[PDB]
Design a protein around this ligand. Sequence first.
Ligand code: NA
Lengths: 229, 245
Amino acid sequence: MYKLVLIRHGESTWNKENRFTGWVDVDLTEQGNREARQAGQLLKEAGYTFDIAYTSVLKRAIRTLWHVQDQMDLMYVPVVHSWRLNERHYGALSGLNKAETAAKYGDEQVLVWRRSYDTPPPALEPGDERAPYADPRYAKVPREQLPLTECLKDTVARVLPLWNESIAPAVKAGKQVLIAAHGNSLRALIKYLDGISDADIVGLNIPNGVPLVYELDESLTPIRHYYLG
Amino acid sequence: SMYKLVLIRHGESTWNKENRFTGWVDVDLTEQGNREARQAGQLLKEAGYTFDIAYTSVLKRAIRTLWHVQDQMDLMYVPVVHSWRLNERHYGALSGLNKAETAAKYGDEQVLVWRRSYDTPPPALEPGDERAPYADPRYAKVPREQLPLTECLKDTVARVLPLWNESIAPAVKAGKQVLIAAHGNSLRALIKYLDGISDADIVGLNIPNGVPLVYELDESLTPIRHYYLGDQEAIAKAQAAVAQQ
Ligand code: NA
């Protein structure tokens, strides 16, 4: 029996505005700060501790992790910041709210995108300000691996290598691991962990700033999972 | 080639403000300390500095100072190495005691020996003291016999330098832009080694809280010069204040 803890970042400014964010590096709102501190308090009171954390390169997830670390008195543990835990890339939808998206692309195409595991939204132009190529976060990432858009299938494909490379060996080694990330990168892990179908994973809701605990057997197969609080 | 190395002592801590020996006790920043650290980050950002990696201690006053700097510079994603080897000098049984009350009790000379004798440590913690480091998860990978119950600066130098030799110096040599966010005595220890300062002279080195301290090093990592970032007159005032304590 191992335990692995997952948590989605607290409310971001763009969550509050119901805007597609993706790789845009927006910060937490004060509510998102509170959710993160509350999650830290919950893990602490329920007797959790961690040896290492994995997070993305996006500050909304990183700041969530900082609050959890702060509240648990774990500010000293090693942290890995991986672009592979970034939120799904939403291409040209990044920055649009629901009304704006419906207006530009029409309801039917939005419905197809919302439902389709393997159809990506319109891509960023490679020269768009929002493209990742000039960003110092991705300086060592092979250029061809950087997305200008992603369907959820793409997101899953680039999240999952972190499982065999890093998370599973750490868990098997007896490390107490925390993963502080984003709705869709957490979906990718959960998709693999619980063997969820392409069709069902699309609808899985994960709330901001609530610790999600997986209990795993010797083979890293889930026994059960639950949210704290 | 010239390399730039940035050092910073933690922002004002609660026990700096209360005038208490701290050592390895894991106290936090005051609001002033938070402001110093944010200002430090703003200054570094405005002066066009960036970092590939930061080294810090396992103590939250230094780590939170680093976090403010990372926050202000938009560098929250960069690699950070947290090492007990950058901890403040271990203050032994003095840890938690008021400096004035201690001087009243044991005399000024005796406290000054404990504070600044290069090679004579403060009285040791008893190993069964709750303040001893043995059950602390921060030190669980440190062999028991290497964990101090007290340190003089000389001891602090011996435990700081292997991190410089094995990790930090190679990273500077490789052209990485390094920030070290640490503590008064662990920074004095490293600087003692970098500037080749004598045992008697290192005594007077006074590093202000929360001020970026830039070293320019040549190809062999020998300092060309160092200087502090920010309001130079305010920094001189802060230096006078540290020296008086
Ligand atoms: Na300690």
